[PDB]
Amino acid sequence: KVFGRCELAAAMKRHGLDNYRGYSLGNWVCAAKFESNFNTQATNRNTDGSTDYGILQINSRWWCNDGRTPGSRNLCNIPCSALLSSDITASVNCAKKIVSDGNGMNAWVAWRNRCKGTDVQAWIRGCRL
Template structure:
C-alpha cells in the first residue's frame, strides 16, 4: 500500500509539471505588461499576446521538436534551443539567453520574458518568431487586449 501511494504521488508531481499553466488572454496580457513587454523594442503588448497564442496557445509547458535542425522550442513563447537556451540535446546550441530550457516551462514566466527580451533585442526582432510573422505582423492586433483591465496600477 505504501508503495502505491509513493507511485501515485510521483505521478501527480509529473502530471502537475507536464500540464504547465494555461493562461487566459487578459491574464497573460497583464503579466506581460507587468514584466515590461509593452513597448519593449517598439513592440506593443498585443504583438506579444498574439505571438504567445500562436506559439503555445498560452501554455507555459508547451514543447515542440523541430526535426529539421534537431532543436526544440520551449514555453509560452516557444524559445528555441538552437539559439537561445540549453537543453543538453540540441547540437551546437548557442544558449544566448544563458539559461536551461527547462526554466522556460515554469508557470512563472519571468525567465521566458527575460529571454524573449534578449531574442527581440537582436536585429531580427520579433521576426525570430515564425508564428508572429505568419499571424500577427502587420495586422490589427487590438482584439488581443480588448476588454482587458490593463490601465489601473498593476503593481
C-alpha cells in the same frame, strides 16, 4: 499553466513587454497565442534536432540549453526547462534579448505569419490593464 488572454496580457505588461523595442502589448499576446496557445508547458521538436520551449516557443539551438542540441548556444544562459515554468519571468527576459537582435519579432514564425500586419490590439481589448 494555461494562461487566460487578459491574465497573460497583465503579466507581460508587468514584466515590461508593453512597447518593448516598439512592439505594443498586443503583438506579444498574439505571438504567445499562436506559438503555444498560452500554454507554458508547450514543447515542439524541429527537424534540425533543436526544440522550442514555453509560451513563446524559444529555440534550444541559440537561446537555452536542453542538453541534446549539439553545438548549440545558450545565449539566455538558462536551462530550457526554466522556460516551461508557470512563472513567465525567464521566458520574458529571454524574449527581450531575442527581440533586441536585428530581426525583432520576425524571429517568431507565428508572429510573422499570423500577427504581423493584423489588428493586434484586438488581443488586449476588454482587459483591465
